[PDB]
Each structure stands twice: as structure tokens, then as C-alpha cells.
Ligand binder design. Structure first.
Ligand SMILES: O=C(O)[C@H]1CCCCN1C(=O)[C@@H](CS)Cc1ccccc1
Ligand SMILES: [Zn+2]
Ligand SMILES: [Zn+2]
Ligand SMILES: [Zn+2]
Ligand SMILES: [Zn+2]
Length: 231
């Protein structure tokens, strides 16, 4: 029961999941309510891989300061898992600090169209549903369209940690979130692909809220199908 929930906006908290694996947790206010957001940090030798910004430039500056204070290793690369602002908002801060920023070509194009910040580098090998590539200490996986058409998930083999980003919902969320960019028809099949490729996952991190087990995948499918049938 130690995962942070406790976090004023502008602040960022780190949570150690395993040796060399942390999540980062930040908050943002939207329509008068406060939402948490998760990302991932993975050690690779004496450097760090960052997965996703902390949802905004100010939060992302605080994230880098937090990392410097608590871990003290340099973030040398970062990956954004889809084109929304809680994933790419802060890429310019990362870039100014010397972090090499990455995303899939689809994510970079969608970010551009949205007027969002655009990661510098393009990830190859992730164009088709079911594609996976090794990227430093993690595997990147494109499960197919779900929360967005471009969304990636991240697996840490040394720790059996599956980071689902916003394609996976926390258990406390029982109604669909922002699905304006989603492929509702394909989302359960994409979740099916995650389960098929990472059935040994022990720790599953949603894009927002509390980690759990692989039960978060069927929970998300249930919420998405209920939203599909809404009326
Ligand atoms: O996915 C979701 O569950 C919904 C609802 C729960 C929190 C996050 N959330 C959001 O929308 C975030 C990041 S995805 C804000 C956003 C703004 C503009 C465009 C996309 C997203
Ligand atoms: Zn999103
Ligand atoms: Zn570069
Ligand atoms: Zn999100
Ligand atoms: Zn449920």
C-alpha cells in the first residue's frame, strides 16, 4: 500500500519497483480535477532510460531534478509511448538537458499534427501489430491500436515489469477515459496481444494510477467493451 497517490501538482515522486526499475508519478489538473500519471525509469549500466515525460514542461523539469537527487545517474535516452501531452509534453525540456528523445514514426507524425512536442529520433521495427524491438534494457512492443493508434507498451525482462501506458487502465477506473483518439474496435484484440506476448509479467503499470497484476488487462477490456455498448 506504499504506491503514491500525496503529490501536489508540479512535484514528482519516484517509486522503486525492482533493482534498477522505478516508476515516476506526477499530477496534473484537468477540468477542476486532479489526475496522477505514471512513467518508467530503467537503469542500463551507469545510465538511465526514461519512458514518458511527467506531463508538462514544469513537471518534466521536476522529474529530472528528482532523478538527479534520488538516483544520480544520467538519463541518456527517453521514449514516448504515444503522442498525447502526458507522454510528449516535456520533450523540449528533455532535449535541452541533453536527453536523446525517441518515438515511433507514427507517434512523431501524430504529435506534429496535434501541435505537440516532437521527439527527435524515430524508432524502427514497430509498424505492425505484434512487432517488438529491444531498446537498451527494455523491450518495446506495438500491440496494435488501442487508446491511440500509435500506443506502445514497454517490458523490462530482468524485473518482469510491464508498463502498459494509457492502453491499460487501473482497477479503480471503471469507465472509459479520453477515447477521442482510440480504436475501440481493436483495443480488446490489442490487449490480447499483450497478454500473449508477456504472460509472465508480475508487475503491470497503467498509464494513470495504481499498479497491479495482469488482471489489469482483462479489466481494461471489460471497461472498453462496456463503453462500446454504451446507450
Ligand atoms: O486516457 C485517459 O484515461 C484520460 C482520463 C484519465 C487520465 C488521462 N486521460 C487523458 O486524456 C490525458 C492523457 S492521455 C489528458 C489528455 C489530454 C489531451 C489528449 C489526450 C490526453
Ligand atoms: Zn493518451
Ligand atoms: Zn540523437
Ligand atoms: Zn495518459
Ligand atoms: Zn474491472
Amino acid at each position: 500500500g506504499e504506491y503514491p497517490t500525496e503529490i501536489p501538482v508540479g512535484e514528482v515522486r519516484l517509486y522503486q519497483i525492482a533493482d534498477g526499475v522505478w516508476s515516476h508519478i506526477a499530477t496534473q489538473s484537468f477540468d477542476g480535477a486532479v489526475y496522477p500519471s505514471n512513467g518508467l525509469i530503467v537503469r542500463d549500466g551507469d545510465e538511465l532510460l526514461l519512458i514518458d515525460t511527467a506531463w508538462g514542461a514544469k513537471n518534466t523539469a521536476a522529474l529530472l531534478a528528482e532523478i538527479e537527487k534520488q538516483i544520480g545517474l544520467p538519463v541518456t535516452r527517453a521514449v514516448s509511448t504515444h503522442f498525447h501531452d502526458d507522454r510528449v509534453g516535456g520533450v523540449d525540456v528533455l532535449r535541452a538537458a541533453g536527453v536523446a528523445t525517441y518515438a515511433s514514426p507514427s507517434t512523431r507524425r501524430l504529435a506534429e499534427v496535434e501541435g505537440n512536442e516532437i521527439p527527435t529520433h524515430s524508432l524502427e521495427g514497430l509498424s505492425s501489430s505484434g512487432d517488438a524491438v529491444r531498446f537498451g534494457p527494455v523491450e518495446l512492443f506495438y500491440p496494435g491500436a488501442a487508446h491511440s493508434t500509435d500506443n506502445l507498451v514497454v517490458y523490462v525482462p530482468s524485473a518482469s515489469v510491464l508498463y502498459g501506458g494509457c492502453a491499460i487502465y487501473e482497477l479503480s477506473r471503471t469507465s472509459a477515459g479520453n477515447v477521442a483518439d482510440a480504436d475501440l474496435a481493436e483495443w480488446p484484440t490489442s490487449i490480447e496481444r499483450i497478454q500473449q506476448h508477456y504472460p509472465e509479467a508480475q508487475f503491470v503499470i497503467p498509464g494513470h494510477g495504481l499498479p497491479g497484476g495482469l488482471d489489469l488487462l482483462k479489466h481494461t477490456t471489460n471497461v472498453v467493451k462496456a463503453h462500446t455498448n454504451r446507450s
